[PDB]
Design a protein around this ligand. Structure first.
Ligand SMILES: NC[C@H]1O[C@H](O[C@H]2[C@H](O)[C@@H](O)[C@H](N)C[C@@H]2N)[C@H](N)[C@@H](O)[C@@H]1O
Ligand SMILES: NC[C@H]1O[C@H](O[C@H]2[C@H](O)[C@@H](O)[C@H](N)C[C@@H]2N)[C@H](N)[C@@H](O)[C@@H]1O
Ligand SMILES: O=C(O)CNC(=O)C(=O)O
Ligand SMILES: O=C(O)CNC(=O)C(=O)O
Ligand code: NI
Ligand code: NI
Lengths: 283, 281
């Protein structure tokens, strides 16, 4: 792997939280980066007011998560599946219904594209190396097809090479040779080494306030958090209208602003509070 | 306009044929890949097709009595679901082993039926526009099948009584600006294709099953006979294509839910209203 000191210029668009919309040139560069590299880093998108509250809420919940009988874990120890709270006080339009994110996902997936994931990845101190995998598979084996899902990753602290910044395989989102992927979405080692010689993977720091948009088929892995603090990531995934997904459970206290929107959510609205803490998204 | 299903699209079976030998299966898949439509004659016993025909003709008054009659594009092409009473749900229709052999090979072992509907073509019906029933998943992109329509004629289909018009090889066409919001083929693309590969209509004997790519161009045509022409329709989809479930009574849950021939089904206590969809839960 290549270990960098900052998000690479070729993958990165610098914004402020005042940027409500990408100008045509910025939008074209964003789509060109997603098409070629399968991953786009957008710095300076979210106010620290929002990331502070989500960070606090997830670190506060983590004891109750680790106290459960069977801790939902992705592939290897230390990579915990943890939903952020879905209390009305912690559901922010600028996170769920971000105008820049939906401008990008509308242009790639269509105006009918919808968020169907409001989850998270808590990377614990002493975590192991995940196998390289994709989060969502190609729809047929041996076939080239365009994207149908875009993962939207929101770091809730500064990500470093020390504390488990995700490893990404740029351009891997279009690879779909026969016999490449097992039932867990893990990449066959023979294909890993072939690809490594043409386009090796990258790990880079990502400052909090950033949003990472990537093809859901991009090869990546969680890596060891060698720090003394848990590394929280909030995770969302936009899908085409026609991809079967269970709905996100949300309280009907947010139905007024979620259900109205031209930024679609596959949501089921519940009277009272949802129990956000046996997870369907843990592999 | 032919006298019988063309040999190039057709496999002749008996109702005893539980499973195709590898060579027959390969020919079936080669026909679906190239032409997008496969006619399987002699698949269903007249015992089963008689009961479904009777049940649908008996229900048609309740359909025609509604304030707005659900109609496909033009007059005479009525949408009518067959009954989902336990006495009229047949494994050899819902869970046909030959159909699922073919749909498993094209769509995967996780492919599932998500449609149990029908098309009642009335005497004096109009010409439908050429359309597809299920669209391509992206505009301007070539991709493999994700759904297979399974059409079961409930009487002999003839050129006179509205045997469906099919456009062989049309299932792979997805150029930009080809399809309107109703899945109708834009006229300029219709005529371009007509010059390369014109459509076909042929009689189909009752007992037959037609399997076609859900993207195949086709149209309902006038029924110029004295009797309504009932068709029972099912559609197999990949596991990952979002569809509402078929409402079924839990009296069939034992044999439907067990099966390695998947159905996207919701099982209900008591009877389903198949015409209005207007049962309480
Ligand atoms: N990037 C978002 C999430 O992606 C993966 O989960 C997928 C999971 O891999 C899929 O099989 C499932 N259909 C959806 C689920 N969201 C990962 N396994 C999750 O840990 C991660 O939070
Ligand atoms: N071939 C099966 C059926 O195909 C069409 O209906 C489709 C319809 O065209 C699709 O948009 C929808 N997603 C499913 C629905 N079953 C037709 N409109 C129906 O009349 C017919 O019974
Ligand atoms: O959380 C991370 O950095 C990476 N995690 C995953 O890719 C996962 O758990 O599927
Ligand atoms: O019933 C027929 O012959 C054809 N009908 C249709 O294709 C339809 O209504 O979608
Ligand atoms: Ni992952
Ligand atoms: Ni049709």
């Amino acid at each position: 792997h290549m270990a960098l000191a900052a998000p690479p210029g070729e993958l990165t668009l610098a914004l402020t939280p005042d940027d409500k919309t990408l100008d045509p040139a910025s939008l074209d560069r964003a789509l060109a980066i997603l098409a070629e590299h399968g991953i786009l880093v957008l710095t300076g998108m979210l106010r620290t007011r929002l990331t502070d509250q989500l960070r606090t809420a997830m670190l506060d919940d983590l004891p109750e998560v680790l106290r459960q009988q069977d801790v939902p874990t992705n592939f290897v120890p230390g990579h915990v599946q943890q939903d952020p709270p879905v209390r009305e006080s912690l559901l922010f339009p600028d996170v769920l219904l971000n105008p820049v994110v939906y401008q990008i996902t509308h242009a790639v997936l269509g105006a009918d594209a919808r968020n169907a994931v409001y989850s998270g990845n808590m990377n614990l101190p002493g975590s192991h190396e995940q196998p390289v995998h994709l989060d969502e598979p190609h729809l047929w084996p041996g076939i080239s097809h365009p994207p149908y899902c875009l993962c939207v990753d929101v770091p809730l602290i500064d990500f470093t090479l020390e504390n488990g910044s995700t490893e990404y395989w740029p351009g891997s989102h279009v690879l779909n040779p026969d016999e490449c992927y097992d039932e867990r979405g893990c990449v066959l080692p023979a294909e890993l080494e072939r690809r490594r010689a043409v386009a090796p993977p990258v790990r880079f720091p990502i400052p909090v306030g950033s949003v990472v948009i990537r093809d859901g088929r991009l090869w990546h892995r969680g890596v060891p958090n060698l720090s003394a603090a848990p590394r929280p990531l909030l995770a969302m995934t936009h899908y085409t209208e026609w991809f079967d997904m269970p709905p996100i459970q949300l309280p009907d206290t947010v139905k007024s602003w979620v259900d109205g929107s031209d930024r679609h959510t596959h949501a089921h609205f519940v009277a009272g509070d949802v129990d956000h803490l046996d997870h369907p998204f843990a592999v």
